[PDB]
């Protein structure tokens, strides 16, 4: 029972893995196919960028505008940039913009998704001139809006660029997210890698790493198969006539009656997605990116992107047969999600309930052999020795995406204590079961027995385990003190930070 | 702490059938290994067959196939299978525990409790 369940877990992660795997290192031989057909100097296609923040870190929007600025492409036709502002607050990122760009500033005291006239035209007049609309604090869906609008206006820009507003581009990005979408005519959405700059802390190394190991893995066989389920946020491509045409039912989202206002960057890939057209990744774009660094936060991150997820892959499925032979593999990689997410539940009850000492070490050897084994694939993939540090992943995973999971899936239907009751109760609920199983099945098998094999291959196991968890962390320590894990990008950004 | 009480145990035939059986009675009785021994007449004891918390069998020799050794968890007993009867088998069984050991197990100071035990004999 418990054997054959590890058996079938370890088979069918090991096998999704490298098809996975397989699929996307398939997808990097087109890509590089097609770019070595790229004739030099390519501006053909016209494109427009969008940049939307609330309340960013001065320092890091200059940065981004600079970033911006140092891209090599010269077919832009002009820069947007839309603050939900409308406040003394929000001044600050206004005046930050006109060091770096230009000087006219709108103000406008309308919102254009709450206006009878959605066309840019009321709000601008002048399409050469780059612009800056500020307007009262809505939410990200609304000033992406306003900044579709604004595109839209010059018949000339055939794609738009979005980028976040702590986002730093590469001068070769803008290409590398626009050329493929010349490539093929079904082609309507590009998405970008996303890599994570800071990595001061063991929590931002293993988000950076995850983060990695998906844009290079499940986003390059999404990609093979031309049905990516998820564009990069902070860098990413649209076509401007799917926009146009999609932006209402993006904009008049309503799940039960109620209008949506997290989950953005899902529902318009999958308005993309019901159109029947292709959406293309590529690797060789980068951009950089800010994570979180306290397990509130990121705990509360990962249940919205949860809420989002599960509010989006019905509609998902629902669209999945519209590809025709395509989208199989989509609905594939769905029902693996759930049905993973089912079996490590199912696992974890079982390991509270039978408690045998046996199946714990062999959960756990097979655990981190599957860790140490998606370490060396991102090693070899990345050509970094710091890859390594993934096999400690599993923590994070088990103590935050379950706890999201129980709140995404409990919260979905139906003073400041009620309010908290809804963050972290289920995560502190969790974390004392976890406790307590653990503290049952030690006191329950407190018991030695050297002349048994299995009782001593279980604790040579869970010794070693153990030992292995130690080395990791007083080599991520040494590696800290001597500030070699910090990624070339951050050596800068701290310098002149502190020249400032 | 457990009390080891045996069951059965009377006279029989070579090659036929007889069932031994130890009762224990503590707080966990699955963490403990049981093991039995004889106690020949002319001899002094020896190791005979023993199982394990985690359902492991030892037996000594000449007895690896004619005994079968198996214990129950729920009614916190253990029984001891005899086939094929010789008169040298006749002797005493003992019932033991031990919750806390070493590598030996086939030494009786290695079991710390024990059993009054049962008297089997075997004629020809």
């Known amino acids: 029972s418990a054997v054959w369940g590890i058996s079938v877990y370890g088979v069918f992660v090991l096998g999704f893995y490298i098809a996975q795997i397989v699929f996307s290192e398939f997808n990097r031989m087109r890509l590089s196919d097609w770019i070595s057909l790229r004739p030099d100097n390519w501006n053909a296609t016209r494109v427009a960028v969008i940049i939307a923040g609330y309340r960013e870190d001065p320092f890091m929007f200059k940065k981004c505008l600079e970033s911006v600025r140092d891209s090599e492409y010269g077919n832009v036709a002009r820069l947007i940039c839309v603050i939900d502002g409308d406040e003394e607050e929000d001044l600050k990122m206004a005046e930050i913009y006109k060091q770096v760009y230009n000087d006219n500033v709108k103000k406008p005291g309308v919102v254009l998704c709450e206006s009878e006239n959605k066309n840019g035209s009321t709000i601008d007049s002048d399409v050469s001139k780059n612009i800056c609309i500020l307007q009262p604090h809505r939410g990200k869906r609304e000033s992406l809006y306003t900044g579709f609008q604004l595109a839209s206006m010059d018949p000339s820009v055939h794609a738009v660029v979005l980028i976040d507003s702590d986002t730093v581009l590469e001068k070769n990005a803008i290409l590398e997210v626009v050329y493929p979408l010349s490539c093929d005519p079904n082609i309507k959405a590009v998405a970008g890698e996303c890599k994570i700059w800071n990595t001061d802390t063991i929590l931002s190394m293993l988000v950076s790493w995850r983060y990695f190991s998906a844009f290079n893995v499940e986003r390059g066989a999404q990609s093979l198969w031309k049905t990516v389920q998820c564009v990069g946020g902070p860098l990413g491509a649209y076509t401007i006539d799917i926009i146009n045409e999609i932006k209402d039912p993006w904009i008049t989202q309503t799940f039960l009656g109620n209008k949506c206002t997290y989950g953005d960057n899902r529902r318009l890939t999958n308005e993309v997605l019901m159109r029947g057209k292709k959406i293309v990744y590529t690797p060789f774009a980068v951009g950089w990116s800010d994570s979180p660094t306290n397990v509130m936060r990121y705990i509360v991150q990962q249940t919205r992107w949860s809420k989002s997820w599960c509010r989006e892959i019905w509609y998902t499925l629902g669209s999945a047969w519209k590809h025709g032979f395509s989208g199989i593999y989509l609905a594939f990689e769905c029902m693996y999600q759930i049905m993973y997410f089912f079996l490590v539940m199912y696992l974890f009850s079982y390991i509270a309930i039978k408690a045998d000492i046996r199946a714990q070490t062999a959960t756990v050897l097979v655990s981190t052999l599957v860790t140490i084994i998606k370490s060396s694939y991102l090693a070899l993939r990345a050509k970094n020795l710091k890859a390594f540090y993934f096999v400690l992943y599993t923590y994070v995973y088990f103590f935050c995406m379950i706890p999201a999971r129980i709140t995404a899936m409990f919260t979905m239907f139906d003073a400041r204590v009620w309010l908290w009751a809804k963050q972290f109760l289920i995560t502190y609920m969790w974390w004392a079961g976890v406790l307590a199983a653990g503290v049952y099945s030690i006191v329950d098998n407190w018991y030695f027995d050297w002349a048994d094999i299995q009782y001593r291959f279980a604790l040579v196991g869970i010794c070693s385990y153990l030992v292995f968890v130690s080395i990791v962390l007083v080599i991520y320590l040494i590696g800290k003190i001597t500030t070699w894990n910090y990624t070339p990008l951050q050596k800068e950004l701290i310098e002149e930070r502190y020249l400032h | 702490q457990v009390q080891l009480v045996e069951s059965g145990g009377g006279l029989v035939q070579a090659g036929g059938s007889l069932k031994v059986s130890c009762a224990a009675s503590?707080?966990?009785?699955?963490?403990?290994?049981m093991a039995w021994f004889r106690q020949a007449p002319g001899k002094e004891r020896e190791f005979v067959s023993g199982?394990?918390?985690?359902?492991?069998?030892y037996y000594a020799d000449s007895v690896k196939g004619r005994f079968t050794i198996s214990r129950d968890n729920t009614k916190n007993t253990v029984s001891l299978q005899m086939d094929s009867l010789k008169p040298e088998d006749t002797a005493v069984y003992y019932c033991?525990?031990?919750?806390?050991?070493?590598?030996?197990?086939?030494?009786?100071?290695?079991?710390?409790?024990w059993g009054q035990g049962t008297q089997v004999t075997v004629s020809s």
């Open positions: 503590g707080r966990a009785f699955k963490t403990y290994r």
């Open positions: 199982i394990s918390a985690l359902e492991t069998t």
């Open positions: 033991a525990a031990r919750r806390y050991g070493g590598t030996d197990y086939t030494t009786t100071g290695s079991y710390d409790y």
